Copies of this chain bind each other. A is one copy, B any other.
Amino acid sequence: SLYKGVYELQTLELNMETLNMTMPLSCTKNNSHHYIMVGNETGLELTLTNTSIINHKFCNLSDAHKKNLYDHALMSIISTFHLSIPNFNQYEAMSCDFNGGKISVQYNLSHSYAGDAANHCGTVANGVLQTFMRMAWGGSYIALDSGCGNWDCIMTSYQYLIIQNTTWEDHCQFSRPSPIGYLGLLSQRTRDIYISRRLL
């Protein structure tokens, strides 16, 4: 590929794994399982599924904070993800279990009255999925009913987004690892939230 007989077109592919020690890296394994890795020890597994693991409406996030048994690196990631969901209002949609320091967060992306006109451009999923799409951006589009051309009415066939702590393993089968998803969300978090109290 020698252009004009003078300029060779050459390529470069970056190994972003060398960045694991200072910043989280995310990748896609397949349509339902996506990952965020931290260093060479841990990270989060983000699964789009039809099976719940939490079957209650408690979270007790404030208890987790007092006890301080969780890995701070992972709680930081969860906080960035949650605050990057635009217009979150349906608080019952999220439930969690931090028992023992383990991290487990479940969003219910199920939409009530689905057969009421399109009725699919304001539900939580329309958000949670947008946030997800960014967190695992290198390959997340494969998991959506429509990967692109639709920003506001994004839907998937999966009913729950479950985010759980996972040990480090090489799961980057669909896409390379990249720090970009996480880094992008850091400037979006809290930018578009609703007020729940007169004094925030």
Contact = CB atoms under 8 A, between A and B. Distances in A.
Nearest to A111: B68
Nearest to A78: B195
Nearest to A62: B196
B68 A199 contact: no
A39 B184 CA distance: 28
A182 to B, nearest CB: 12
Main secondary structure of the interface of A (DSSP, over half): loop
What is the interface residue range for chain A against chain B? Answer: 20 to 34
B200 A200 contact: yes
Interface of A: 59, 61-62, 65-66, 68, 72, 75-76, 78-79, 82-83, 87-92, 94, 122, 186, 189-200
15 contacts: A59-B198, A61-B195, A61-B196, A62-B197, A66-B92, A68-B89, A68-B90, A75-B87, A76-B192, A76-B194, A78-B195, A79-B193, A82-B195, A91-B198, A189-B191
